[PDB]
Design a protein around this ligand. Structure first.
Ligand code: E7P
Ligand code: MG
Length: 295
């Protein structure tokens, strides 16, 4: 029945000083303070009987103006055994579809559609079909070109995945993007599996269409359900993370759902948000100490 709050900074802007952590724990009449990573993350056991909304407000006020995330959850079952993570803008820094659109000279036009889709102003499937249509005729060679030159991994990604695997979790990269990208990215980072949409080609060029049925918001929910059943758990045993509206289904279903640097309307709908930390934040959310990490 007991609660814990966790404060989390970005390791590249590690502002959670010892004095700040004590101030915060004092602000909630805390029963102790445990450092998971110096200047980066600490656990604050909530005294019994405090509603979690109270502590979230109290901690956010004390920390106001500092780049430090606040999450509150029950201490039991906070370490999860399934990771399901979006790719674009979550484990990589880019949108694979916007990068491809550059090679058709249409980056800005396509990127504006992507922003509306990720904010939830347009359904994923029509938005994908509209953007992919504009890639018609691009040579297949363009995929390796984009991957090799413009895709970069998000900080903390490999450590999150490898540390969770080290502790026996099953990890999946589940994306509205393209298998030609996820297959490479997933093995770069170290996921157990990936699942994404598929660009159709004629053997030499992109046709400008995607294999149906398109995997969208509900497909991520279904894949989370499929994974939990196959490994003999439930979605409650999963942590899900993404930035876009098409991730809200899995974020809401999972036992721990994280809106990570999410679009404005997306973050508004998430129970748990990380706006300053990098992907290592999900390790601290789960109670890992830096000593546990795969370094
Ligand atoms: N963000 C991309 C979908 C790929 P993702 O699900 O983020 O890995 C898009 O708007 O088409
Ligand atoms: Mg995304």
């Amino acid at each position: 029945v007991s609660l814990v709050a966790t404060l989390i900074a970005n390791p590249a802007k590690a502002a959670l000083a010892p004095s700040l952590g004590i101030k915060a724990s004092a602000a909630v009449n805390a029963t102790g303070l445990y450092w998971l990573a110096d200047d980066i993350a600490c656990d604050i056991p909530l005294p019994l009987g405090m509603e979690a909304s109270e502590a979230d407000a109290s901690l956010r006020a004390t920390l106001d103006g500092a780049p430090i995330d606040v999450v509150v959850q029950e201490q039991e079952r906070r370490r999860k055994k399934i990771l399901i993570a979006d790719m674009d803008s979550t484990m990589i820094g880019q949108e694979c579809i916007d990068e491809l659109a550059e090679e058709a000279g249409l980056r800005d036009h396509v990127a504006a559609i992507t922003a509306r889709a990720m904010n939830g102003e347009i359904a994923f499937e029509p938005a994908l079909r509209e953007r992919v249509a504009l890639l018609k005729g691009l040579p297949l060679s363009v995929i390796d070109k984009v991957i090799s030159t413009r895709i970069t991994l998000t900080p903390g990604g490999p450590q999150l995945v490898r540390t969770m695997r080290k502790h026996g979790a099953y990890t999946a990269l589940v994306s509205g993007g393209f298998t030609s990208f996820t297959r490479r990215i997933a093995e770069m980072i170290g996921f157990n599996e990936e699942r994404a949409n598929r660009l159709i080609d004629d053997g030499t060029r992109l046709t400008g269409t995607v294999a149906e049925p398109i995997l969208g918001r509900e497909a991520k929910v279904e894949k989370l359900v499929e994974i939990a059943e196959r490994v003999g758990l439930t979605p409650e045993d999963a942590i899900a993370v993404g930035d876009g509206a098409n991730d809200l289904g899995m974020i809401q279903l999972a036992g721990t759902g994280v809106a990570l640097h999410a679009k404005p309307a997306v973050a508004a709908q998430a129970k748990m948000r990380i706006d300053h930390g990098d992907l290592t934040a999900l390790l601290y959310i789960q109670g890992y100490r830096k000593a546990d990490f795969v370094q």
